[PDB]
Amino acid sequence: TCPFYKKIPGTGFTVDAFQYGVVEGCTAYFLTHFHSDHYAGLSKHFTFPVYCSEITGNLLKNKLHVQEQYIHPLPLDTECIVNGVKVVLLDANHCPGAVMILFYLPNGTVILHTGDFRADPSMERSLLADQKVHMLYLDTTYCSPEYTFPSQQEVIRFAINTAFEAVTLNPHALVVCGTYSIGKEKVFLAIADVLGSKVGMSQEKYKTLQCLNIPEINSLITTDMCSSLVHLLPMMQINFKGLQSHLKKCGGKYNQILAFRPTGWTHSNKFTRIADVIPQTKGNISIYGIPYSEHSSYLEMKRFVQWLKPQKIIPTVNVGTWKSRSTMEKYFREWKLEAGY
Ligand code: NI
């Protein structure tokens, strides 16, 4: 059955709760973003109202084949009414179309659900600053002080300079970027833009990108692999064997590969700065691991919560074991004692 952390008190709303069949009482199902864990259980067979951003609606329609009658897209940064209750969707700074939702309850309680998010100080001057928030449903993916990472912009700058140098040294090198879902598009779009190229990709991936409301998209991406010097492949193919295999497929049009694996955190964040990063190399193929995160670091999460000063926190990630919950509650109390709320 649907856990309490996916229910919004004193409404018939749920959030990211599609895997439990019909939820008793639920009149509106919200979807924060188009990642399989969150949408799990949604298909062309679903027949209840789904509320979401315009981008998330495009994906539901075109990728999952959810029937149009059941998709209720809402604009961002706009007060809307859903089944008699005031809501606002805000940018989550996660993947394309990902939202946080602000719910103004009839009794006067205010609840923020972050979805998945990468906390940023620009969120301190949104509609959130206008009133007190009593309860916070929080993306606790990286809620532990070891989880540090560079800014998105540091990582992109590094990727850009690396790619530009390699292709100027060898104009027959191919650049490859690994991917498994939506998110982290700036990695491959920034590399292509410094090389004067479109990004080549499969038909399924191109169809996905065509849903994302990216300006001038037709000028940036193609299904003609031949004509492009940046290619997208599934993350699972980003290894020496998969990359040599792909190089054979391209018809001797390239004689070297440089590949990027955008990952979350891995243990080497605790010493290395982005400027120290060096690739793994076997022959004419080099692979760079780059920590491009679309989740809050510990410090980013802490700052946001200490600003917001919620009366209660409800974790939405790593809640499956008592040890994790206990650990997280300890950090929430520290933050509250330091900041005086
Ligand atoms: Ni996500």
mmCIF file of N, CA and C and ligand atoms in Angstrom, residues 33 35 94 116, ligand 1:
data_model
loop_
_atom_site.group_PDB
_atom_site.id
_atom_site.type_symbol
_atom_site.label_atom_id
_atom_site.label_comp_id
_atom_site.label_asym_id
_atom_site.label_seq_id
_atom_site.Cartn_x
_atom_site.Cartn_y
_atom_site.Cartn_z
ATOM 1 N N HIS A 33 8.423 14.362 -12.127
ATOM 2 C CA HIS A 33 9.298 14.317 -13.306
ATOM 3 C C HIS A 33 9.322 12.926 -13.923
ATOM 4 N N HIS A 35 11.244 10.256 -14.555
ATOM 5 C CA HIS A 35 12.262 9.218 -14.274
ATOM 6 C C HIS A 35 11.506 7.918 -13.835
ATOM 7 N N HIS A 94 16.547 19.885 -11.590
ATOM 8 C CA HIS A 94 16.844 18.440 -11.677
ATOM 9 C C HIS A 94 16.994 18.167 -13.180
ATOM 10 N N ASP A 116 12.546 15.231 -6.893
ATOM 11 C CA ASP A 116 14.015 15.219 -6.962
ATOM 12 C C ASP A 116 14.448 16.657 -7.273
HETATM 13 NI NI NI B 1 15.104 11.809 -10.630
#
